[PDB]
Ligand binder design. Structure first.
Ligand code: HEC
Ligand code: HEC
Ligand code: HEC
Ligand code: HEC
Ligand code: HEC
Ligand code: HEC
Ligand code: HEC
Ligand code: HEC
Ligand code: HEC
Ligand code: HEC
Ligand code: HEC
Ligand code: HEC
Ligand code: HEC
Ligand code: HEC
Ligand SMILES: [Ca+2]
Ligand SMILES: [Ca+2]
Lengths: 520, 259, 520
């Protein structure tokens, strides 16, 4: 049984915590729920930590008083098909392997499944750790609660004796690095300096051995990623997001200065040895658009190359942890502003960006976003109970599972079937354009070896490579983005038509150049 | 937002609560969750209460940290047919009127329905208060959450100006008395002496005017009827039960001394 | 009404039958249920048959006393989509036509459907008889009971006047030969010598005119394929299987000598004119792993070519009826041991194997097989009845239709949805790797004409052809195998990664060789 500690004693040294804790809705929640600080209190001074207190980061620390939210979070949506590869004819990107050739995603890229699995899925995907980590057996893939209890309760490491990234199976990659983990867990929140920069007080950083870092991490999507444990108020903890919104002053809604001001973020910095160490972003309001944008964004979390000179940009560089915080039509400019690209296409040699799940940036400017709707309205609605205390569902899943609460409450003119039909109209239309964009990209890509072998000049190949960048960007955004156009159908339409235009331009350029070589 | 109070100061006078609270699973739960004792602490001595502190008896006091248990409790089972009279050919006792003739149950005795309604159903049944109390309208009969929030949020009193038990409709009875309420609520747990005996410190007792008592009561089946708020440990609070089991030495299982 | 015959009279000459019949559970079942032997008994001698007795091979011969088993067998699973071509984007092998080009399966290869249809489906598939046989009309495709009553009750022959294999429609093949029928029916069990070898007493053999043979055959999957009609004990009748397990001494579980000994097979030979003629394999136990392995295996049942010198191996050769009885990683060695391959790829010219439904060999060594689980546990479980005499369901179908009896009885920790999710995780993962294997095989195949035309040497082409063999084998096993990895997910994973490795090696070899030619 827990025994309370005297928080006044802590507050003597922890003024920032005092100011948060005493004012919020956790003012009566004793520190012992999450911290074991006995030896810390015996040894600390006002500027030196002394013995490190233990801080609980398990979600059960919150589930004791918030079982409803915890249970809704950990529910596994069995209809979210697991380990479903996107590069197949029946999934999101039928020609993905040809289009992404040269990139680590060619090894495996599955559709997302329920949040409980995020950390385990990150660890076991074929592109991440060379196949080092596996579930203990193939039955464990169902065990959401187990994954939440801790990744290492359900996973095995092929070689606990080594800590290097290497292939354990031939068709795997070792793309994982420490930045990835920031969107899977915040178990490292006290051990990682802001942005993963080198820091005396940080156990882990962008340049750490990711296998060793992995072994230290257990829990997915900690509840405190969106809720300050001290004030219980809304926040974000993701460094990349704070950096974009606050440090770079882009604001929470870069396209709406007024909304950015009303629904803003306040950066709170915590120090170690009186030197800035870590930060959180306190939100003005409980704005799930910004909470979900901690992870559902396009980002860099990887080494890459400079657009200017093609030189390597390694994990040690700040750019290896970066939120572009730019919609699809501002993205090329945002990548130019940091002088960065992700990979060279294996066939065309083009410098290309790699886009990932840009839901937050896609949502900006959509009809729903403009009308003050937020992710949670459709994906974590309040529960409707005939007789019950209302709480917010933490199931984070498609509104198809709860259309009454997620759509039909606003769309009184529709039945569930009508609303589903509206969704399907958009997704079907968008998917048709994605498929057409891929057809044209693939047609362009296939001409590169023919052009090279026909003696087409490097100048013409480079012209086509520049078009490839744009054709790729304006296509890939939409296979990366999870709503298949729903979050912003007009933007998807304009973008995908732009992709096709670019590819058609490249096809015509290469075809003409090949024919001119043949004629000469 | 709640501000915690200095529980150690309470414990200077409240040794019994200290021994329960500091040992159980509510040792970290501050008194401010259930008591407003500011003026009490200002005026009390260990021998004089001073200002009476306020104690929350609402189930929301527990639902804050125990929403899953509260929500399962308050759910209304619509399949438990409401206001279904047992003295009919299709219910439990087709000849009940003949057999029970001379007893107040002849006026109305329905099947039970979900616990959320126990106090409101007690107040509105035809045999209890002469028809004095009704739901605010016939729609309110569905409102389990409302009844749990408080009986008087969903009921009306035909005559707030009188406190006597009398018939307001011809075929009703006034069988209710203060003892009934002990199986409907424990909102009176600090205002009722053991067994409802007369007591200088008891606002209410077996001989109280039941209508006046009724008006003071709000919540059905308080969570603390089975769970001690201080220790979080299992308990009962019903005097009649404690009297049988302990005072009369019958034990919890009168047919099984080992159990 | 049947009238019993005096079996003692038969037993005077039929000692093997006496020894089986008098001891088993059919000891009270009179011969007249299945044999009309009146004129036989009048004319036979102890060594000469005299008039041939009639033997009933229709399944109704057993259905009279075993209606429950018969009815469960003949049920048509309408959810098993009929005539569903595998070489489409929504089926098992999207790039099958490119990959299998040169082989008869390019004409048509559908997913399997319910067992009642096996013989009719064999007769009507476009790759088998040149389109000679059709259902009487398109309505008859539903008639499982009709097919079971007899193929010729529901099919028509385009030309009853000729018996040659030829095309009746342009896009058909004539791949059928007599060996195929051994996995469709055993109506010929008394007319076919062991292995289909030439024999004086055999009406049919490997070299027979298959159209004439076809016309003599009526019933699918006779009940006596797994149950000896005389002893009622468990057996197999399939020559290829007996030959692998017993003649070649490979055992029923080639990877487990102990299990092979406990769950073994005893070959029983029957003679004609005191010369070995046909054989059965009596099983030590009712082991469905071995019963189903009569057909659900990789086999040769076709002409092919020698790996050594490329010469034709015709139906007359023993190798035209062969069970490799080898898992995917032992298969290349098993094909080398008989010096055999199936076809030359139409584009690459590579000698290639053709793999078919190797469920039995894939199942070996899997977690379930190692734990003593057998096909029937998942595909023909005992019926569960609140009040009823239990019998074994003969419906032979996916456990999805009976998850309570097929999985959940062993997997108490799971709900049906969890178990289905576990299956889908494996199938989704495996299918993603199949698709990737095909992508790489197709990329390799497409380089062959480019390499040939660029002047790449035969030595380099032959190197790539040798890689093609392996890339093909380690892919095709898994489109052939029906569980999409479920029966052995680790093996599927290792194999498919091997396929991709081989293809990538071939792509790199050919690309480099083409570029070197272009540069010269
Ligand atoms: C000892 C019980 C207890 C623990 C442990 C606890 N909380 Fe709370 N929490 C409360 C109470 C009490 C409230 C106030 C409820 C109210 O009045 O609305 C609260 C309020 C909240 C709110 C609403 C705050 C607001 O401003 O609306 C959030 C979000 C919350 N808690 C999250 C968490 C998270 C995340 C954890 C785990 C780090 C956690 N809590 C741990 C008891 C707890
Ligand atoms: C910590 C980073 C992170 C945060 C914050 C986050 N997500 Fe996710 N989300 C993921 C990852 C990772 C997955 C895929 C998990 C997996 O496949 O194992 C995912 C999956 C999902 C899915 C697919 C679930 C399914 O059934 O397939 C939805 C919908 C989703 N997120 C919505 C949201 C919404 C809405 C928010 C804000 C309330 C949110 N997410 C916050 C990382 C995050
Ligand atoms: C900005 C936050 C963020 C970073 C950094 C991030 N992810 Fe994710 N990850 C997500 C979200 C959101 C999802 C679910 C949406 C989706 O998959 O499209 C996801 C899904 C996944 C999935 C399940 C779907 C799939 O792709 O197979 C895996 C595996 C995964 N991430 C691995 C990685 C690896 C490896 C890294 C580092 C190279 C990484 N993640 C970096 C946010 C992030
Ligand atoms: C991706 C961000 C995110 C994560 C992670 C998160 N929540 Fe929440 N939570 C929300 C949002 C959004 C709301 C509703 C805010 C609003 O509309 O007022 C919410 C509301 C709450 C509330 C207020 C009562 C209610 O239900 O509205 C509690 C308590 C809470 N969450 C607890 C948890 C616990 C416990 C966890 C960990 C299992 C958790 N949250 C994880 C975003 C998050
Ligand atoms: C107006 C409602 C609405 C809002 C607001 C909304 N989405 Fe969605 N979201 C959808 C619909 C509809 C789909 C398609 C789901 C489907 O077809 O089942 C979708 C799909 C998703 C998916 C893929 C889910 C799956 O299972 O395939 C993710 C992840 C997601 N949204 C995240 C977000 C995030 C993060 C935000 C806030 C930036 C957001 N959404 C805003 C309605 C919304
Ligand atoms: C501020 C939050 C909070 C409030 C208010 C609260 N509890 Fe609890 N309760 C807890 C915590 C924390 C535990 C211990 C959970 C654990 O460790 O298992 C707990 C434990 C319990 C247990 C389990 C005790 C045991 O020994 O197993 C019961 C029963 C319980 N509470 C009932 C109540 C009732 C009834 C009320 C209303 C009088 C109430 N609680 C008020 C937080 C609260
Ligand atoms: C405070 C007294 C009290 C306690 C303690 C109590 N009950 Fe009840 N119970 C009632 C009353 C009064 C009703 C009828 C309520 C009504 O009709 O409005 C009832 C109704 C029920 C019903 C019928 C519910 C329905 O759907 O019709 C069941 C079952 C029941 N109780 C079981 C229990 C069990 C089991 C416990 C112990 C966990 C319990 N009760 C504790 C007083 C109580
Ligand atoms: C020992 C505890 C106890 C006492 C005292 C008690 N009840 Fe009840 N009451 C119950 C239980 C338990 C139920 C539900 C089971 C049932 O109705 O059989 C119930 C059900 C009811 C119901 C709904 C069913 C019906 O009979 O119409 C009413 C109304 C009711 N009581 C009124 C009264 C009145 C009036 C008194 C005082 C004369 C009274 N109760 C005294 C325990 C009690
Ligand atoms: C005249 C009725 C009759 C006919 C015809 C008949 N059987 Fe049987 N069969 C029996 C009886 C009686 C048993 C013993 C049942 C028992 O005692 O378990 C039996 C037992 C069996 C058993 C269980 C044997 C064992 O050892 O467990 C199988 C398998 C079987 N029969 C298959 C067949 C097949 C296949 C046919 C058609 C070739 C067939 N039977 C024809 C009556 C019949
Ligand atoms: C005589 C050879 C043969 C034997 C023995 C045999 N099968 Fe089959 N099986 C087939 C053929 C041929 C098909 C496809 C039939 C068709 O498509 O018309 C098939 C189809 C199936 C299917 C797919 C059915 C559907 O609904 O699509 C399953 C499952 C199956 N077999 C399992 C088994 C199991 C388990 C055993 C052992 C109990 C077994 N089979 C024994 C030849 C056989
Ligand atoms: C070793 C036994 C075996 C032999 C020999 C065999 N089959 Fe099959 N056949 C099967 C099994 C098992 C299935 C069902 C599993 C599957 O199709 O993958 C099957 C399925 C079929 C199907 C339905 C699915 C499809 O491919 O369209 C046809 C048609 C078929 N066989 C024709 C043939 C022809 C023609 C031959 C000879 C060239 C042949 N079979 C030889 C066992 C065999
Ligand atoms: C592919 C092999 C196979 C075929 C063909 C087959 N069965 Fe069976 N049969 C089994 C297996 C396996 C069992 C159960 C053996 C065990 O577990 O004891 C079984 C059991 C039996 C039993 C024993 C009683 C029972 O239900 O367990 C009878 C009778 C039987 N089958 C009759 C038939 C009849 C009649 C047919 C033809 C319609 C038939 N079988 C076709 C494999 C076969
Ligand atoms: C532990 C249970 C289990 C065992 C044992 C098992 N399988 Fe399967 N089998 C499966 C599952 C699961 C599938 C995939 C079915 C699905 O996804 O609907 C499958 C698929 C099949 C299919 C394709 C069925 C269809 O409709 O798609 C055939 C044929 C098959 N198995 C035959 C066999 C044979 C022959 C054996 C014995 C050598 C065997 N299986 C052993 C569980 C089993
Ligand atoms: C006769 C009992 C039995 C049956 C039937 C059975 N299993 Fe199993 N299974 C086991 C045991 C023991 C292990 C270890 C295991 C292992 C597994 C594993 C982990 C395997 C691995 O490779 O790590 C999965 C997934 C699984 N079973 C699913 C199923 C599904 C799905 C079915 C139904 C098609 C099923 N099982 C049928 C007993 C059984
Ligand atoms: Ca990116
Ligand atoms: Ca073969």
């Amino acid at each position: 049984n827990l025994k309370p500690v005297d928080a006044m004693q802590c507050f003597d040294c922890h003024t920032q915590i005092e100011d948060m804790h005493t004012v919020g809705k956790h003012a009566t929640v004793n520190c012992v729920h999450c911290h074991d600080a006995t030896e810390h209190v015996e040894t600390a001074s006002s500027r030196r930590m002394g013995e490190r207190p233990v801080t609980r980061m398990d979600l059960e620390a919150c589930a004791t008083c918030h079982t409803a939210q915890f249970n809704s979070f950990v529910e596994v949506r069995h209809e979210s098909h697991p380990r479903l590869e996107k590069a197949t004819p029946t999934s999101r990107s039928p020609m993905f392997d040809k289009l992404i050739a040269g990139h680590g995603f060619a090894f495996e890229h599955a559709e997302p499944r329920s949040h409980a699995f995020m950390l385990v899925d990150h660890f076991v995907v074929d592109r991440a750790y060379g196949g080092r980590f596996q579930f203990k057996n193939w039955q464990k893939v169902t065990d959401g609660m187990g994954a939440v209890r801790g990744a290492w309760t359900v996973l095995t490491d092929a070689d606990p004796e080594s800590s290097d990234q290497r292939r354990f199976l031939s068709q795997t990659a070792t793309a994982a690095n420490p930045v990835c983990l920031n969107c899977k867990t915040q178990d490292h929140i006290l051990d990682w300096a802001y942005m993963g920069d080198e820091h005396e007080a940080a156990k882990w950083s962008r340049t750490s051995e990711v296998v060793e870092f992995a072994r230290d991490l257990n829990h997915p999507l900690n509840c405190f990623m969106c809720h300050d444990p001290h004030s219980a108020g809304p926040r974000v903890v993701r460094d990349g997001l704070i950096n974009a919104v606050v440090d770079r002053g882009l604001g929470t809604y870069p396209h709406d200065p007024v909304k950015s001001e009303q629904q803003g973020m306040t950066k709170v910095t915590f120090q170690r040895g009186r030197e800035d160490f870590r930060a959180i972003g306190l939100l003005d309001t409980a704005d799930s658009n910004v909470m979900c944008a901690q992870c559902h964004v396009e980002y860099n979390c990887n080494p890459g190359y400079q657009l200017s000179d093609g030189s390597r940009v390694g994990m040690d560089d700040r750019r290896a942890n970066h939120f572009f915080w730019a919609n699809v039509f501002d993205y090329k400019e945002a990548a130019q502003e940091i002088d960065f690209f992700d990979f060279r296409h294996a066939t065309t040699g083009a410098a290309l960006p790699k886009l990932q799940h840009p839901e937050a940036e896609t949502f900006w400017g959509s009809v729903h976003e403009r009308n003050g709707v937020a992710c949670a309205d459709c994906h974590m609605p309040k529960v409707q109970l005939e007789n019950g205390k209302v709480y917010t569902s933490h199931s984070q899943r498609t509104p198809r599972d709860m259309m009454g609460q997620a759509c039909l409450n606003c769309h009184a003119e529709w039945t569930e079937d009508q609303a589903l039909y509206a969704i399907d109209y958009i997704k079907n239309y968008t998917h048709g354009k994605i498929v057409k964009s891929e057809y044209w990209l693939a047609k362009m890509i296939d001409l590169f070896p023919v052009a090279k072998r026909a003696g087409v000049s490097e100048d013409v190949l480079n012209q086509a490579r520049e078009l490839h960048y744009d054709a790729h960007l304006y296509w890939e955004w939409w296979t990366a983005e999870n709503s298949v156009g729903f979050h912003n159908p007009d933007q998807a339409r304009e973008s995908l038509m732009t992709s096709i235009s670019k590819s058609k331009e490249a096809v015509s350029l290469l075809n003409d150049a090949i024919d001119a070589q043949v004629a000469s």
